[PDB]
Design a protein around this ligand. Structure first.
Ligand SMILES: [Mg+2]
Lengths: 79, 1334, 50, 50, 251
């Protein structure tokens, strides 16, 4: 979290100085860490996304309906 | 005419000589964002308004300060094109000049201390495309103009409960625009009660305790302020004539020396008249008269400071005398007499004694903050700051307006703020609406208020960013250094750009466009809603908001609105419509003066509309005279009836101004049905572009401006000779005298290509023209998906016959010859899309390569020598396009497979296959690949390099073989090596002719070309060769992305849904061989056969008229055909063609051909042969007489009824049949786009139950209806099969499955999981519930 | 032409400040009804066994 | 209304005759689309007794 | 459970479970410290509330919602109304081996007949044709049968006809008002993508060909096959039981 504080502080100084989007090499340097950390944190900032949301604009498809389950078996494989 | 309409005339049966030409709609956004951006010297708007509003910033002492100087925008770096591709903001930099002037505070305010004038970049701004689109992150995004709001009072009347009074009782309500609500209510005991937004019940009253009043002014609302003057003994007093309005004179209302109203006598209109006319409200009256009266206000003796009489207390004579002795010869009276003032506030005071404001404020707190302790600045700041502070009314200048505009304010704009004056004035206008006439807004009528229009929101989020700035600006100004602290060191480029990004790119009410049709996209642009924020909902709104209002005329098309839940809520805009400034709608209506229908036109609002009388444009004007007949069709009062001629105040402009554009396009609507015309108007927008462009023979006249205004135009360059000619490009060479010596002056133009639609259809443009012909400005230089020479093209023109046929046109179905698809003229295309995300894999990047063991990697074993890459690189369905591989983990090391990879032995890490392939059965066209950034590995990638270097070596050799002409020639200037130049090898010419000063410079310019060019090749080689040589190792998650799109085109077949332009649908059920079509003794068979089963019950007679007027048109087209094959002389072409143009009765529209030369008539006749159209304007349509004269001019039957021959036996049928040509429409509602049938799919999580939706392999859900039909039936087995196995149970389905393959189809019942779930659910509730397990 | 003369009379009646509207208005509708029901007769006579 | 449809489909309509028909069309249509529930309830409550 | 993109997915109950356990453990803390029992009262109200919300959340007061601002489904609703077991998915299921698509007329059908685009014939009847390709043994294994049937042998057609001969199947159009909206005909295999339908039963279906689609269902077992042929059949149903009139009206 302290690292992430440093980054979401330093990124903004960066886009000031830049004035346009810091895709992670126009971000990484001033952060003081290489590209891969900024990128990794850019991935991990996804809190999960709550099945009970209506991905259908209508009350037609809560995400739970779309989910497929690839764990048990397929009967042709048993055969 | 114009060349594009010379080259093809739409004959026009319109007569009604129109004063107006059709309007345009889009003016408000350009002006808004322009003024925001505009260099306003004096009248600031937006930007410079904001700047001069904020800067300069300083200390109050003067210690330091920054200065504003000016602003300038930068060029937006990339184009909107890359901003649509790349997934990028379209935006332009911002640059502001700022100076840091600073003062000596030692000297008083000596300014010469520091001056740092420099310019500051601070973020780009997204800008407006020429549509108004704002491309942000790959994406054009847009406003909706949204229709919403309403106050009022609405209460019933109860007659004379106090029968002595006989009074009407009505409660009363307020709606502030913003803030809290508040009601009266009268009860059965005749008492005025109140609820302050559902506060505790009190003596309070509505706006009055909102406005801090006691009983006197609660009474003063309806009644007024009489003043008693006791003149040295005697009472006198004064009046308003509209106080004593239908009231009883107890005594003699006389005057100075004249008697108005005697005793017991009511002050009739005669009495108020003479009471006004004689200039008297003055009279000598008895003092006792005051007995019964109520004092208006608290009165005292100033000597005392004692209430002689409190406010709202009945006056007398002992208080008369005391008031008068105290210093009141003026007794204002409020009036609680007895009769009509039923003692309501009195009984309330006898029930409740609170009569103070601070209790009003505490109770304000307490309703607002119930259970919370009232504190006075809390209750008061609550009461005020909530809905009168500028903070809350955020600042919105559409607000500012919206309140000006809900004020009846003339100031559109004003300040940047919404002064609470705007609030109370909007509220007072709104309560003046409700007390007056009950028309608050245009709720459902499409006259559009209050509509929040476009552009403005940019400024809202702009200034939000400005505040996001200004806080930190403060924190760093006051704290940090002042002298050494530049503005740009205080200026961050993030929030303003970040806002105008977020909002232009995140919204409701904005979504992808309906691209299938220029009609659909205009009427999508000419579309209105009653939904969204601040709007309605389908479940909350009813029928009143769905049916149409009599204001609709000239404002609302009642014919373009869906049939679903959106039936009346959704409804489209009419043709001649515009927008008033308050949002509202006004309407063209021809002024009628003296009955003479004046050609100037006034834009009447709907509230103006009803009070005036409007005549109809169907009216027979008497030739600049007036309405001819006594009974003009005019209209007012929300109802039509029959009135005189000079009485007209307006007439309608056109026979159109009610209609929308989509409804403008069916000819002969006047012979059509509202539901079927409604169905036609909807499916017209669902018509789909064909490959070719076939026009309508029958028009209404509106085809051209819609094909045009869905597009734009072009321009020219210097005089010259046309260099290169093309569908879309032209190159011109400028003349030598025009060519400046420095430039080459190869004036070149730009061009057009293919593209997909938002709805998976095709985009393109082609010419309707030639090169070396004059182009009148405003012409159409290139056609569209649905346009040709500048008119609409939704469908095709061809034969029709109306018959049953052997059950093939049983119910609404369609039959058709084989020959139409030999032409493919309905056959057409669907561009589809396919993709490859190549992402980061832990085991290593997915690499683009494909290596294969396992002998042949089979059936490749059985092939001929050739092999599925078979001759000429041929490839089947299923083959690979982009071979991507992904590194693979390891797996359990079983002896068999490990023996197999000891046989073949894929080296190590076993980079698993991920090739991008042709999915099964594809007959499309993998038309191109874009990408977004082992043995055959190296073959494919160095061969990709073979490909690419040959591409780009070509690119080189062309682009520099260009330049080698000038290199050579540059020697030949300054002498001539007239035969010394060429034959010796070309390079060794600089050693030829050379002279003094000015040539060696060009020997070296020449050498510089030799340098720069081979240098750039070295550059590009480096880049290109490495980028093909590199493996996939690109970016976070972007290892790379590869792209594909398809184009599926094949012949049409049963299931496709075809139709015309009157609701006349149809499903296909067979294609008919031509010999198996009806034919005639001419042997000429029918294209299609239709069932006339429904036209009486469909009542789409316009389709019939369409048909006849089409048959006659092929009548003229065949004449020109024969004149072509027979190759007529110029004279005859002239004769016949001018005979063709001037054919109609009194055609409004007129051309001569003697204007043109011969070859122009040749171009004219060589461009018309696909067809000339005709306009049947909608309600100014054709007549039976015209089409019949026209048809027999074709030598055809008058009614186009012709004996037809079957060819299954060759005979004649019994009766002749109607024959002629209709104009029909394809749709995106294709059996292609409809067919799927599938099997079980997925299951959910929390209930674990199977799927519905065919695309994802769905089973269909059932209601209780459908299981209970099975109960009625008796399939108890099948019921339990539909209770356990397929959805809830497991042992049932799997026992059943094992058994059916054992042949025994036996039943084992168990229990649905639903049941034990029920138990555990009701058992978490702590109740004993449990299974009775078998 | 007959309906034209009829409504012209209706107009002049309205001009008088007599039949004012409801009598007039109902009168007008009833005569339109009858006029084109006669049209309906004319036409169904002018097809079926002509 | 007391001033009717005079013409027919062959002869030719007026704009407002048409527009008056749109009302009855829409009212009857909303009745159609919004009573499958009414039978829905009556039927299914009756069956659940069964 | 997870999703493809690492995102996770849950039932709302876990929320309330966590709430109750946490409040209880904090109460175990407060009761070890002999804390001022005003907080023990507040924790008791809170424990009872979290219980009662596990029991019934949105009945008491203002409902509990996420950052969504939407309230969260309880246990009770998973038994109750529509989305409970009963009305949605215990009484009324999604079906294995089914199909549906647009319909057109069969003017030359006999009564017992119906179209079948052999594509979906094959899709629904792959187990029979597979068992029969093993019985004959051309496809010696199910790899072989599946690859042979992806490659659409000529025998797959004759054997599809063989299997489909005397093999009834159901037909269903929405809305299924009364019994005769769903019947069982004999297949007629066609390569026409539109279902053909004996025109006289357009009325029982209330069906007319303006873009309609029918749906289809498979009697696998033999009680179901024989019901389809004896009871749902087109030839045992000739009168409304509402009233003894014929249902064979000329269309
Ligand atoms: Mg239908």
């Amino acid at each position: 979290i302290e690292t992430i504080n440093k980054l979401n502080r330093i990124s903004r100084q960066m886009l000031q100085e830049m004035g346009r989007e810091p895709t992670p090499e126009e971000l990484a340097e001033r952060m003081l860490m290489p590209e891969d950390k900024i990128r990794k944190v850019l991935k991990i900032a996804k809190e999960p996304i709550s099945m009970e949301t209506p991905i259908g604009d209508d009350e037609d498809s809560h995400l739970g309906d779309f989910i497929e389950d690839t764990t048990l078996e397929l009967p042709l494989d048993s055969a | 005419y114009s060349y594009t309409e010379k080259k093809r005339i739409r004959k026009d049966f319109g007569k009604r000589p129109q004063v107006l030409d059709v309007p345009y709609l889009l003016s408000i956004q350009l002006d808004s964002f322009q003024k925001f951006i505009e260099q306003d010297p004096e009248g600031q708007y937006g930007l410079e308004a904001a700047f001069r509003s904020v800067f300069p910033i300083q200390s109050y002492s003067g210690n330091s300060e920054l200065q504003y100087v000016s602003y300038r925008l930068g060029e937006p770096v990339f184009d909107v094109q890359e901003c649509q591709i790349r997934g990028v903001t379209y935006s332009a930099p911002l640059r502001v000049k700022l100076r840091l002037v600073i003062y000596e505070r030692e000297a008083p305010e000596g300014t010469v201390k520091d001056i740092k004038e420099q310019e500051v970049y601070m973020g780009e701004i997204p800008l407006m495309t020429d549509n108004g689109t704002f491309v942000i992150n790959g994406t054009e995004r847009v406003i909706v103009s949204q229709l919403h709001r309403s106050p009022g009072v609405f209460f019933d009347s109860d007659k004379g409960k106090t029968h002595s009074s006989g009074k009407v009782l009505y409660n009363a309500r307020i709606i502030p625009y913003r803030g809290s609500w508040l009601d009266f209510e009268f009860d059965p005991k005749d008492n005025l009660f109140v609820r302050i937004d559902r506060r505790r019940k009190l003596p309070a009253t509505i706006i009055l305790r909102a406005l801090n009043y006691t009983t006197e002014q609660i009474l003063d609302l309806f009644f007024e302020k009489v003043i008693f003057e006791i003149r040295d003994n005697k009472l006198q007093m004064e009046l308003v004539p509209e106080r004593l309005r239908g009231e009883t004179a107890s005594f003699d209302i006389e005057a100075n020396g004249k008697v108005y109203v005697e005793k017991g006598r009511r002050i009739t209109a005669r009495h108020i008249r003479q009471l006004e006319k004689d200039d008297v409200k003055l009279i000598e009256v008895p003092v006792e008269y005051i007995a019964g009266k109520v004092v208006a206000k608290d009165y005292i003796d100033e000597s005392t400071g004692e209430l002689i009489c409190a406010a709202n207390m009945e006056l007398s004579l002992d208080l008369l005398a005391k008031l008068s002795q105290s210093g009141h010869k003026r007794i204002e009276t409020l009036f609680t007499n007895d009769l009509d003032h039923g003692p309501y506030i009195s009984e309330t005071l006898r029930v409740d004694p609170t009569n103070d404001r601070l209790s009003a404020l505490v109770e304000i707190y307490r309703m607002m903050r119930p259970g919370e302790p009232p504190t006075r600045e809390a209750a008061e700041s609550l009461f005020e700051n909530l809905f009168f502070s500028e903070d809350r009314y955020d600042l919105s200048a559409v607000g500012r307006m919206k309140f000006n505009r809900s004020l009846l304010r003339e100031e559109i704009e004003g300040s940047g703020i919404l002064s609470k004056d705007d609030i109370i004035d909007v509220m007072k206008k709104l309560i003046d609406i409700r007390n007056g006439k009950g028309e608050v807004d245009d709720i459902d009528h499409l006259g559009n208020r209050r509509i929040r229009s476009v552009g403005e929101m940019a400024e809202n989020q702009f200034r939000v960013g400005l505040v996001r700035v200004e806080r930190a600006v403060k924190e760093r100004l006051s704290l940090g250094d002042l002298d050494t602290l530049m503005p740009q060191d205080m200026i961050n480029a993030k929030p303003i750009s970040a806002a105008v990004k977020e909002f232009f790119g995140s919204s409701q009410l904005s979504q992808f466009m309906d691209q299938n049709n220029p009609l659909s996209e205009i009427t999508h642009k000419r579309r209105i809603s009653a939904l969204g924020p601040g709007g309605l909902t389908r479940e909350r709104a009813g029928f009143e908001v769905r049916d149409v209002h009599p204001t609709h005329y000239g404002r609302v098309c009642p014919i373009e609105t869906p049939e679903g839940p959106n039936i009346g809520l959704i409804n489209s805009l009419s043709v001649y419509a515009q927008t008033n400034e308050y949002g509202f709608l006004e309407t063209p209506y021809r002024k009628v003066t003296d009955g003479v229908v004046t050609d100037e036109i006034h834009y009447l609002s709907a509230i103006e509309e009803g009070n005036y009388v409007i005549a109809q444009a169907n009216s027979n004007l008497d030739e600049e005279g007036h309405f001819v007949e006594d009974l003009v069709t005019c209209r007012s009062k929300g109802e039509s009836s029959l009135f005189s001629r000079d009485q007209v105040d307006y007439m309608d402009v056109s026979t159109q101004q009610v209609v929308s554009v989509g409804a403008s396009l069916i000819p002969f609507l006047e012979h059509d049905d509202a539901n079927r015309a409604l169905m036609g108007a909807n499916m017209q927008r669902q018509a789909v572009p064909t490959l070719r462009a076939d026009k309508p023979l029958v028009g209404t006249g509106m085809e051209r401006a819609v094909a045009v205004d869905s597009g734009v135009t072009a321009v020219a360059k210097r005089g010259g000779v046309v260099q290169y000619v093309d569908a879309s490009r032209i190159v011109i060479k400028v003349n030598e005298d025009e060519m400046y010596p420095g430039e080459a002056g190869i004036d070149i133009y730009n061009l057009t290509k293919y593209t997909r639609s938002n709805q998976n259809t095709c985009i393109n443009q082609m010419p309707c023209v030639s090169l070396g012909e004059p182009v009148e400005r405003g012409d159409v230089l290139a056609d569209g998906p649905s346009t040709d020479l500048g008119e609409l093209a939704l469908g095709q023109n061809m034969r029709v016959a109306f018959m049953p046929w052997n059950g093939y046109n049983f119910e609404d179905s369609i039959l058709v010859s084989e020959r139409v698809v030999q032409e493919d003229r309905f056959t057409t295309i669907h561009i589809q899309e396919l993709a490859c995300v190549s992402r980061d894999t832990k085991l290593g990047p997915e690499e683009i390569t494909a290596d294969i063991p396992n002998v042949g990697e089979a059936a490749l074993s059985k092939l001929d020598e050739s092999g599925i890459v078979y001759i000429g690189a041929e490839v089947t369905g299923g083959d690979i396009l982009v071979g991507k591989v992904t590194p693979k983990g390891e797996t359990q090391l079983t002896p068999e497979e490990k023996l197999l990879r000891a046989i073949f032995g894929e080296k190590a890490s076993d980079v698993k296959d991920s090739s991008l392939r042709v999915p099964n059965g594809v007959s499309g066209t993998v038309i191109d690949v874009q990408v977004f950034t082992d043995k055959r590995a190296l073959e494919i990638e160095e061969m990709q390099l073979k490909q690419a270097k040959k591409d780009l070596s070509e690119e080189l050799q062309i682009l520099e073989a260009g330049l080698f002409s000038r290199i050579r020639a540059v020697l030949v200037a300054g002498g001539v090596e007239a035969e010394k130049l060429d034959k010796l090898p070309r390079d060794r010419w600089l050693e030829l002719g050379l002279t003094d000063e000015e040539k060696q410079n060009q020997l070296e310019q020449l050498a510089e070309q030799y340098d720069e060019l081979k240098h750039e090749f070295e550059k590009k080689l480096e880049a290109k060769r490495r980028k093909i040589t590199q493996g996939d190792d690109l970016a976070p998650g972007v290892l790379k992305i590869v792209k594909v799109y398809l184009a599926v085109k094949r012949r049409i077949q049963p299931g496709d849904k075809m139709a015309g332009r009157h609701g006349n649908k149809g499903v296909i059920s067979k294609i008919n061989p031509i010999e198996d079509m009806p034919y005639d003794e001419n042997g000429t068979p029918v294209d299609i056969v239709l069932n006339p089963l429904g036209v009486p019950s469909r009542m789409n007679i316009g389709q019939i008229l369409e048909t006849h007027l089409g048959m006659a048109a092929k009548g003229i087209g065949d004449k020109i055909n024969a004149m072509l094959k027979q190759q007529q002389e110029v004279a005859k072409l002239r004769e016949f063609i001018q005979r063709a143009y001037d054919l109609g009765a009194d055609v409004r529209q007129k051309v001569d051909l003697s204007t043109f030369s011969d070859e122009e008539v040749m171009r004219l006749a060589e461009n018309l042969r696909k067809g000339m159209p005709i306009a049947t304007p909608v309600f100014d349509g054709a007549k039976e007489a015209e089409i019949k004269e026209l048809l027999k001019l074709g030598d055809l039957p008058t009614s186009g009824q012709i004996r037809l021959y079957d060819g299954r036996t060759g005979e004649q049928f019994e009766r002749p049949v109607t024959v002629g040509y209709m104009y029909m429409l394809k749709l995106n509602h294709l059996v292609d786009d409809k067919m799927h049938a599938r099997s079980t799919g997925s299951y959910s999580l929390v209930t674990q139950q199977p799927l519905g939706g065919k695309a994802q392999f769905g089973g269909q859900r059932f209601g209780e209806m459908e299981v209970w039909a099975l109960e009625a039936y008796g399939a108890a087995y099948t019921l339990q099969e539909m209770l356990t196995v397929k959805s809830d149970d497991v042992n049932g389905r799997t026992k059943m499955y094992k058994n059916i393959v054992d042949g025994n189809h036996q039943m084992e019942p168990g229990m649905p999981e639903s049941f034990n779930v029920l138990l555990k659910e009701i058992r978490s509730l702590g109740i004993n519930i449990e299974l009775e397990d078998e | 032409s007959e309906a034209e003369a009829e409504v012209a009379e209706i107009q002049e009646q309205f001009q008088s400040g007599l039949v004012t509207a409801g009598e007039r208005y109902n009168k007008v509708i009833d005569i339109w009804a009858a006029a084109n029901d006669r049209v309906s007769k004319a036409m169904m006579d002018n097809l079926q066994t002509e | 209304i007391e001033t009717p449809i005079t013409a027919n489909f062959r002869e030719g309509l007026n704009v407002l005759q048409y527009f008056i028909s749109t009302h009855g069309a829409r009212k009857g249509l909303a009745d159609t689309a919004l009573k499958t529930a009414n039978s829905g309830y009556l039927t299914r409550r009756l069956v659940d007794v069964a | 459970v997870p999703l493809d993109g690492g995102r996770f997915a849950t039932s709302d109950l876990n929320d309330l479970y966590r709430r109750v356990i946490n409040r209880n453990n904090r109460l175990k803390r407060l009761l070890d410290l002999a804390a001022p029992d005003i907080i023990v009262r507040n924790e008791k109200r809170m424990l009872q509330e979290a219980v009662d919300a596990l029991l019934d959340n949105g009945r008491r007061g203002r409902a509990i919602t996420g950052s969504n601002k939407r309230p969260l489904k309880s246990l009770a609703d998973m038994i109750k109304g529509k989305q409970g077991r009963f009305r949605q998915n215990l009484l009324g299921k999604r079906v294995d081996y089914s199909g549906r698509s647009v319909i057109t007329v069969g003017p030359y059908l006999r009564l017992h007949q119906c179209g079948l685009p052999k594509k979906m014939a094959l899709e629904l009847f792959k187990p029979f044709i597979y068992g029969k390709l093993e019985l004959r043994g051309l496809a010696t294994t199910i790899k072989a049968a599946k690859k042979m049937v992806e490659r659409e042998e000529a025998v797959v057609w004759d054997i599809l006809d063989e299997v489909i001969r005397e093999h009834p199947v159901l037909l269903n159009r929405a809305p299924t008002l009364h019994r005769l909206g769903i019947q069982a005909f004999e297949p007629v295999l066609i390569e026409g993508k539109a279902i053909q339908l004996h025109p006289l039963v357009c009325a029982a279906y209330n069906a007319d060909f303006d873009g309609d689609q029918m749906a289809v269902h498979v009697p696998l077992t033999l009680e179901a096959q024989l019901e389809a042929r004896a009871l749902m059949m087109s030839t045992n149903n000739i009168l409304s039981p509402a009233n003894g009139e014929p249902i064979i009206v000329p269309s």
